[PDB]
Amino acid sequence: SAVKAARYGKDNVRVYKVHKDEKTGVQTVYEMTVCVLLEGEIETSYTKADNSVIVATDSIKNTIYITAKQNPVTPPELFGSILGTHFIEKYNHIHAAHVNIVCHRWTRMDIDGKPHPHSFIRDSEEKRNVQVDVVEGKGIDIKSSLSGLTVLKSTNSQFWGFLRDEYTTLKETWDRILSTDVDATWQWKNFSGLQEVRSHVPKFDATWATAREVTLKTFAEDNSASVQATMYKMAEQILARQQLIETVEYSLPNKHYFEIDLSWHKGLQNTGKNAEVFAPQSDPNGLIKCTVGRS
């Protein structure tokens, strides 16, 4: 037997960092969960009980805190690239670092119409994420994402003209509820190393903001022929607005809300044009995925 692939490291490392502006007194908080996995010439720790090649996962944890102390933690694309590069430069036998970061929302509170200097609220479990793969001699690959964005529209969604056969019971519809949790990922062109990532720093926050805005606007405005059709329009627009993105991937549950026929009770009318009360279904759900790239 042989080791075909191996990676190890520390997961679920929670980090908080505060920045204090001494002039204005304003404070800003960042909170993240970080995972770092390493690869390299480490096979002998598996096959010969040779621990000499192991950077302890506890040390990886220490390194994350030290790196956060000495560097900016925003945008997460930059922080992940700094953290990944550290491991491949510091340790000769480590040739790849894989860094995943989940950023948690701490939104500044407005108290009496003005921004508070040091109080924050978690407005929603929506996350901003990055995956950074730093590979010795192959540069830095970054995938940025948003997830956990839950939306619903109560009309302007249709679904008709699908294949009908002996397995089909679904009725065609020209008016339904559409609800989903959005997971969108944009993959950056490969960067040669940290200098190049630093040169593009302003594009990271701007493109996150654009991806979010395009997603919400298109969802709200499209008279949707299907989830497939609406999600394609989203990805098309993101690719048009940022030339440094190579692909956009969407993964969307279709969370079903079923009509409830109440006619058995005093002829009560609650279907089709008369539908007012629906039953949200926890499961099953549709799952629709697409990866869109350039011609």
Add this chain to the structure above:
Amino acid sequence: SAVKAARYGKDNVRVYKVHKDEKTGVQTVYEMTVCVLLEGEIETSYTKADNSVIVATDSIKNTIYITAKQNPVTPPELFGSILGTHFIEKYNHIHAAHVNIVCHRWTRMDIDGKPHPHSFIRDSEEKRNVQVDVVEGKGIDIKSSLSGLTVLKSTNSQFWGFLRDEYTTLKETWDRILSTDVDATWQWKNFSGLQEVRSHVPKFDATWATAREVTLKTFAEDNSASVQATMYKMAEQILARQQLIETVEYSLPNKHYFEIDLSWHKGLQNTGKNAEVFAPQSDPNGLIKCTVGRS
């Protein structure tokens, strides 16, 4: 042996309702999870296998949808009271109904600075809840609550002057992070029945809004001596602003963020006045509760 207490019913009934304004074209959605448990002369279903006294839980589920179809579902205090009253009036042998409702946020989207007519976003897992107990001949008791409101302040929290003995290791502090998930409940004076609840309908949304506003403002502005002291100030203010509330209860986790001493690494300074990077602790957590009423 004897049946000392018994209640039964249907839990986790998910309901969505849409209102359509034909004039303006604006749609508004409500989504709730409802639990209804009944009590009454039902002991024989337990002791003698006498099912004749059982309103089937499936029928309770049907009743929730029918009631939602025929009545407004907002404010939840009114809807719960209508639903509870139904069971005690309809069934002679049912003498109490206990209705719990969790309201889920669907917030209207703003697209290009204007409110969208039919698209919504789940901005946070904060809930608005009600517990309604309708008891034959004893009226309607309502407890309203908000929960899942997660906040953090990065300074202006202190904790010193506590008891010190041989079990104590905690250092006194004049500057710490304070973070909590707020659970606040206000209990209404007993109402004689549905007519009285209907007469107070405007107070329900207004008092929810006041409770939320007082919580956020007090948390942001108090130079907090302890969670105990800050939470008392919140409850005091709610009671002052709404005379129909008898008690206010707060239950608050103290979610700890620990300093990380990095001095072992190149004399790096990250504690006390130099603290920038902290480790959020998933567990254990403080849990502080208070019920405040009138003199």
Add this chain to the structure above:
Amino acid sequence: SAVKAARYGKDNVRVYKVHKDEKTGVQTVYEMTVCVLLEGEIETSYTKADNSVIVATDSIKNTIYITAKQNPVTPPELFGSILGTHFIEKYNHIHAAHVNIVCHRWTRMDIDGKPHPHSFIRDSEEKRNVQVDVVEGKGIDIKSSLSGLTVLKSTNSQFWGFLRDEYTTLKETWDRILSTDVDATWQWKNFSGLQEVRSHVPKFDATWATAREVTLKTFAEDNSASVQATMYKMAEQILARQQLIETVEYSLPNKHYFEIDLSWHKGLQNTGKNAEVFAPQSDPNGLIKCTVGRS
């Protein structure tokens, strides 16, 4: 305004303890999550920012570890009573301690038909729990419970003869699936203090084992007329077997498995006597509760 009720303390304190038999080499592990909340003359910490009355929650955490170090942690009823008594005896102004303990399963592994001296498996998320309330001058009240025991029987469950009216669609049945998650609690007669609890130590594990055995046997053997009827038979038997229990409470979800009519597809027969494939429903669920005590 006045403080009507107040309690505070530390929640989610995870504890592991190992016992090592030096003779045999056998090791035994216990793992628990503990919550301790205190009450007493602590109102001024809320109303006057007087921290002098506060035993810090961090100190409560320390006390839990110290107490576990110096005392047996099994049965949990004894450990909770020791922990609760500590606080009311140590601190003059603390008059009640409320201790909740959740015991996690670590079951000794059998390797090649023999018990391993130091390796364990988590066989199921079933918990054994205790709630201990120690109140100065009113003794020790203990409620013991099991929870998270998930069972299913595929036949020998019926449900017919229930109330039928204009809200009813449920068909009567003489053969259905019955599945539930069992939560059972037995409440002990009040104990005068720690000496009396110690005198009954052997009854705690024996009664837990009896409650579990009665639950499983009755569920498997009863040709169930309803959840109500079957749960009553369980509680009756527990009360008969242990005279020091005052009440038994069961809380049982009825987790529904629905027939699927497949007749629309090539006349496929899958209902009534022909039912083979069912759809488990995540929600809603029935919820049935009973508290049984002595004549």
Add this chain to the structure above:
Amino acid sequence: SAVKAARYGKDNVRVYKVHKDEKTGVQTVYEMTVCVLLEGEIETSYTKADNSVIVATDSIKNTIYITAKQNPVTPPELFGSILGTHFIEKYNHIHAAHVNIVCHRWTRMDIDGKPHPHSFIRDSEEKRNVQVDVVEGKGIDIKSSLSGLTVLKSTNSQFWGFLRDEYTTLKETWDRILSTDVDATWQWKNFSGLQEVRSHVPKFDATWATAREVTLKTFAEDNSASVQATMYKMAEQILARQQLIETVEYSLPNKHYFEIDLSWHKGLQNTGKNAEVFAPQSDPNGLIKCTVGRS
């Protein structure tokens, strides 16, 4: 822009099936959660709103129930292969089906030392899983797995001789607790189609049982030099016992249990050889992965 990749289908489809032996009266239940995603010539549903190419996800759901009705659901490797093959043979324009199945434990109850004919218990959240990819003209690729197997050993685990540098604080140890949740996957050699899968049917359950047994025995018996070293020994043995497996992958969290120094309190000794009470850490955790294949 172009569609680079696309797949869609139905997730979280819960299925239960009962088998009834008319002779013996014994019943056996199977419960699964199934996900089916399809790929093929479906790009136009995304790019041109052409729904004619879409097999509705609701129809996929119907197909899962119909297939379960007409075929055995065990072993899951066979059922997944039947389900996947159905879609690629039935629909000319569908060229790949991806089927994931999670099998839930329903273990027959023993009542008074004998197996009950129709009552079952969920003994643990351990799952048996399969991933089946059926690709037109490239056969059937099956990965089988177990997950959610949580174990702990209280001694006979060491970790010393790792890299030490300026980022390292971890002390070497010759005696620690080792606890993990096991995720193990074995990948079968490619099968040409359904006939070949059927020919190997007995190997599926046998190899699952072997993988489980090897995992538990090796964990319990290895005087572990590291998680890396112990997991390699597991994979080596599985590959030796089943020649039709090409690779074995393990993914293991290292769930930390920390010593608690209590010496500050009356010189209490609770570290090193005196350690009895530990604090389980919810996060962070080590994460160690390996894929082992044949020379």
